[PDB]
Amino acid sequence: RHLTVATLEERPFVIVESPDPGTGGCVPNTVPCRRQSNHTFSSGDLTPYTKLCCKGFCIDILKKLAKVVKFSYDLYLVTNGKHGKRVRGVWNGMIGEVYYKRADMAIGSLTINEERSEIIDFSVPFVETGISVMVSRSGLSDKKFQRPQDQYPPFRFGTVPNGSTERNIRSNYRDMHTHMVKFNQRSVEDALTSLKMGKLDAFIYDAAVLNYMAGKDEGCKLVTIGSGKVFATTGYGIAMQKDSHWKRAIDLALLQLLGDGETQKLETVWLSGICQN
Amino acid sequence: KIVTIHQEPFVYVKPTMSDGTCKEEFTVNGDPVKKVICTGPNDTSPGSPRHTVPQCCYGFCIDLLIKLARTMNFTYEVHLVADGKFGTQERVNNSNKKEWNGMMGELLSGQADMIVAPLTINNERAQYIEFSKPFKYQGLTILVKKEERITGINDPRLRNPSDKFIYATVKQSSVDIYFRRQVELSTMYRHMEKHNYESAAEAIQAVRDNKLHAFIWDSAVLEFEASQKCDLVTTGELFFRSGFGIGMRKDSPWKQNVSLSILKSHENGFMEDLDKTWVR
Amino acid sequence: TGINDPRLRNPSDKFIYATVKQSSVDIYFRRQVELSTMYRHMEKHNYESAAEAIQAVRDNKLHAFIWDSAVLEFEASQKCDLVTTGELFFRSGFGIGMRKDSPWKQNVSLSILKSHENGFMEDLDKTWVRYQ
């Protein structure tokens, strides 16, 4: 009844914080979490792991899963790679920690693709999302995307590399992928600030995170197309080790709770925005 | 074995000609629509003489099943569901155990081995039918004609039912299961058992005839008919978002194959091309 | 938009909002664990009295001030330079509270109830809060 859970920081779903110094721990709604510390990175036993408080949407849903299926869990943040990629045929991140079994399950901004699926068993997706483009204030058939390196002043747009979106683009748009590798970005908010003055024209990434951006945006900059026009409809789901027994239980519990409608309230309290409409 | 229900946004069913073949009907792009011969009763069984007349059938679900069949290289047989209803466990008359009907029952009996339809995933089905990953995303909404814009699932006029406002859903359907689970909504469920319809066509016409006031159903279906039929509008947000996922029998090996197939179809957007072929 | 605005549903640094520390609404926000984040904002801007926060809002130092209804609509009807918003989401009562042991509990209860059926506080409202 205990599992290994690991994630990294993706703002609206993952929030890391230092524990309250005046209390030692912190307020409720948060769970203890720690650095990814291996045998070499154990950093001694005087401070075996720096306690941190991790709270968020995924934290709440995993809390409900634990309280339903009656299982415990230990949480540690991930350092080696963001989430996972077949780097030289070797996976990293949560994908590496699960496939090579330093981890039991995974939760977070885990986009489900085909490759991850044959690599890692997934659950039913608890939320829907996919590809979207956001620009300061038109479709994957537009010359702005079809051949942005042929006419006009070169159109300056990009994304973050080593991601599922990058995998799909490289697998469908290798010429445009070669164009985009010129425009890679350190972080989502980094490119956001870049386009706030106009370093890059538009950003291509998850629809959900851009919804969270624009919903709280003070400038109210909207995505390339109303309603996002989400391409390659996918979601976020629980990642299980290959043919793990937990699959049936977690799927049944997750779908039952999704039908109960409280997930609507959790998304209302977590990812809602101000000027989204 | 292919089983389904005639659903205009996803399943088009027409009578074959006297010669027993499908019409050479081509798309606006000039390519013919890929149509098969699905057998089954000529009209609904109570009103029908129970003649299992084969009829031409084609559409979105048909297109995707053809694609995935070409991917897995297997033949098939197409035949719609006998009762015309989705189905659920029910302590039927003179019985004790809650028993499925519809295509779930037809599969558990073995009449069909896998379902191809815009079926909704619910936990109740999850215990008995293996759902793969969703192939489409959709939601639940309300439809009216053409002034008291209905307040989604938050209007008291729904919460305290009135004889001036008549509304219902389809029996033995996913929305029935949903309204049955939320006991707080039970009163509207009590309204349901008054006027529940049996198929989309009659309910749509009755709303167009104002026999009904508002109909709760899939987002995709309502937006499709609105973009094609007009004169009627959906209202309120998608109070319950979910997926249409291709379901199939428990523990049969093909689940992983079809799952990765629909994943790679989402990778190249082939399903998006299907939608553009079917939703303009 | 009352209480259900993501401006307040999601705590925002650009927007300032607070109350009086060591007050009932402090306990309200403390028990509402899901609202603890806004309680985190409370820790930065909590005032000590009403008048200085009122001046700050009139000086626009404070964007919004949450507090009890009666006093607030009284101030709104008197000064008219500030506007109230949000419904009385927390129904409550102003009552004479005192020690459990003393016998005046029931006596004072019945006396104030007799005044209520007599509309004595209605006359008091006409005297102090109404006609403004």
Ligand SMILES: *[C@@H]1O[C@H](CO)[C@@H](O[C@@H]2O[C@H](CO)[C@@H](O[C@H]3O[C@H](CO)[C@@H](O)[C@H](O)[C@@H]3O)[C@H](O)[C@H]2NC(C)=O)[C@H](O)[C@H]1NC(C)=O
């Ligand atoms: C897809 O369905 C398949 C059949 O139900 C099955 O994967 C299949 O597994 C066989 C067995 O390895 C593969 O056959 C290859 O390997 C054998 C043994 O080495 C050879 O004798 C064959 O000639 C062939 O080279 C199939 O190729 C494989 N099918 C696929 C599509 O990869 C799984 O149920 C599903 N697997 C996948 C990957 O979708």
Ligand SMILES: *[C@@H]1O[C@H](CO)[C@@H](O)[C@H](O)[C@H]1NC(C)=O
């Ligand atoms: C055709 O189908 C058979 C059986 O389903 C399979 O063994 C064979 O590999 C398929 N051929 C192709 C080209 O897919």
